[PDB]
Write a protein that binds this ligand. Structure first.
Ligand SMILES: Nc1ncnc2c1ncn2[C@@H]1O[C@H](COP(=O)(O)OP(=O)(O)O)[C@@H](O)[C@H]1O
Lengths: 152, 380, 53
């Protein structure tokens, strides 16, 4: 939901603030699910540099991108379009692992869904790195909305 | 069509798409495992005559061939190979390769229900007493198996259902096998008598064989009258084959060596042609009858039956139930659906009182000559 | 003695055969578990008494 009466979700954004392991971790969790429908660039602007900081065991930004994927879902965010284009392509900080590959990949895959010509840079973090998650998703940015078809 | 237009092109995308990477990538789940298990093996099954001691050398008759006293696999102790055990035999080497389990033929397994007949205790109106005991014979012992020990006793390990044709006995089978859980074996006596002499005996065994390896299973016999009920005898030896089959069922059903968690459900219309050896308790304890609904019952039967259709909410099934003295709950069903025709025969959604009244007078009365519920009451 | 006996006897394949006639003209015929009759002129390992149909 949004908050109806008591806005416990929004105040949480105060508690998120820290570039440390478990704090970010479940705050990333909290704020992912906070900012589905409460979506905010801040948490990005919080996590984006933490994402630029790129430390799963400390910055926790790995899974953050996924929580970030949980923020603007189904919308074109030119920033995240560029932002992870500015991180993943850049391979910010620690990234060697297929981790910061994929934490950022699927980060774009959620947010965009249904924008038409605006969703093109989602693959840029996703189908870039060759995995079983790669050459297929190339057209999955197309079905970025349907809910009733896929058996094909 | 625009939505439909979007539908077609969208589907064509995948169609177009799928062909793409198809070109790109051009067995091992199996061809490995196939070729893996190709260097594997076959082993002709064997039937052990028996082993010997001061050493092993197991003694065996295969099948289409003959007996070979032959060594056994190194991987199987000298115990886990009791007699009468279809084991597998290094084909050429002719030495016990691995052990196995027992035959049951393709007639006993063909009747293990797999699925389950949707017939909850909601459709079983007018039997607060019938199902009440049944649940004791079948439900409670199979599920909550504490009390019967906390106090130490035994439940009607088998139970009998009888009544004219149309009381709901087959629903109770279907009802039970539904909310039961155990293994519900549906075996009809029609199944039991075949052609060549002494053939049914194999069925009961298999039945009791398969009943056994699986603790807590419901054997159900609908139409037991078919298998065997009376023990005639004369200068013709007619219903002899079937009689034994009964004795077989009799014997294994409660005579020397316990049976186990094989609970037993028998369904008849004529509970009068049945051998005392069936009837007696031990074999068939709880004896349950399925009355021809009285007053409050049929109302539940009507309400249950009609509860699931578009009926006129003013009309009270009670009146109809009153005009139904002794008709089974089945006929009452021909009415509820009967109005359907009438209700459809004009053009209407909802039925009226008369729609039922007619049905009552249309089914019951008209289809009275037939009924057979009054000839089957005295079990003829 | 022990040597060859183990090779010939050690052969755990054993085709049981129900004796038939115990001709003493030391001869004796037998029908196999394969339903095959072979007149063995050397009852081999197995005393006469051991012998009977
Ligand atoms: N009290 C009842 N409640 C619900 N349905 C009933 C009742 N009595 C009879 N029926 C219906 O009538 C049919 C009678 O079946 P059953 O008595 O098993 O036939 P048979 O007597 O040939 O074994 C069942 O299919 C059931 O749907």
């Amino acid at each position: 939901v949004r908050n109806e009466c008591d806005p416990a979700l929004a105040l949480l954004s105060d508690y998120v603030l820290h570039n440390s392991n478990t704090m970010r971790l479940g705050s990333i969790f909290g704020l992912g699910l906070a900012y589905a429908g409460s979506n905010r660039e801040d948490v990005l602007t919080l996590l984006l540099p933490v994402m630029g900081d790129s430390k799963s065991s400390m910055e926790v930004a790995g899974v953050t991108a996924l929580a970030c994927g949980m923020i603007a879902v189904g919308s074109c965010n030119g920033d995240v379009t560029s932002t992870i284009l500015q991180t993943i392509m850049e391979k910010s900080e620690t990234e060697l692992k297929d981790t910061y590959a994929r934490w950022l990949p699927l980060g774009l895959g959620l947010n965009h869904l249904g924008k038409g010509e605006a969703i093109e840079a989602i693959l840029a973090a996703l189908e870039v790195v060759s995995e079983p998650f790669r050459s297929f998703a190339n057209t999955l940015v197309d079905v970025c909305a349907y809910a009733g078809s896929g058996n094909v | 069509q625009v939505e439909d237009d979007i539908q077609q092109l969208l589907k064509k995308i995948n169609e177009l798409t799928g062909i793409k990477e198809s070109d790109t990538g051009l067995l091992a789940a199996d061809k490995q495992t196939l070729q893996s298990e190709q260097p594997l093996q076959v082993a002709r099954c064997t039937k052990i005559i028996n082993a010997d001691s001061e050493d092993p050398k197991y003694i065996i008759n295969v099948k289409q061939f003959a007996k070979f006293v032959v060594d056994l696999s190194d991987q199987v102790a000298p115990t886990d190979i009791e007699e009468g055990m279809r084991v597998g035999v290094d084909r050429n080497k002719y030495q016990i390769h691995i052990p196995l389990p027992p035959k049951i033929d393709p007639t006993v397994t063909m009747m293990q229900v797999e699925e389950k007949p949707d017939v909850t205790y909601s459709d079983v109106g007018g039997c607060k007493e019938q199902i009440e005991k049944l649940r004791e014979v079948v439900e409670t012992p199979l599920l909550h198996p504490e009390r019967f020990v906390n106090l130490g006793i035994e439940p009607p390990k088998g139970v009998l259902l009888f009544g004219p044709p149309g009381t709901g006995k087959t629903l109770c089978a279907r009802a039970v096998a539904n909310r039961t859980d155990a293994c519900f074996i549906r075996v009809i006596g029609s199944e039991l008598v075949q052609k060549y002499v002494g053939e049914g005996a194999r069925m009961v065994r298999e039945l009791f064989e398969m009943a056994r390896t699986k603790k807590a299973c419901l054997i159900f016999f609908d139409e037991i009258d078919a298998i065997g009920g009376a023990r005639f005898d004369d200068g013709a030896g007619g219903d002899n084959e079937v009689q034994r089959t009964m004795l077989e069922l009799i014997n294994q059903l409660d005579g020397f060596d316990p049976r186990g968690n094989i609970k037993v459900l028998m369904a008849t219309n004529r509970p009068d042609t049945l051998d005392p050896a069936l009837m007696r308790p031990g074999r068939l304890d709880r004896k349950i009858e399925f009355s021809l609904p009285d007053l409050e019952g049929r109302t539940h039967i009507f309400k249950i039956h009609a509860r699931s259709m578009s009926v006129e909410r003013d009309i009270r099934f009670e009146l109809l139930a009153r005009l139904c003295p002794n008709s089974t709950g089945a006929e009452i069903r021909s009415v509820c659906t009967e109005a359907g025709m009438f209700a459809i025969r004009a053009r209407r959604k909802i039925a009226t009182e008369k729609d039922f009244l007619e049905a009552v007078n249309k089914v019951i009365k008209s289809y009275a000559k037939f009924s057979a519920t009054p000839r089957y009451m005295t079990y003829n | 003695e022990n040597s060859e006996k183990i090779k010939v006897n050690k052969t755990l394949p054993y085709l049981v055969s129900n004796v038939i006639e115990l001709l003493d003209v030391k001869c004796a015929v037998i029908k196999t578990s394969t339903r095959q009759t072979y007149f063995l002129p050397v009852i081999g390992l197995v005393d006469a008494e051991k012998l009977k149909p």
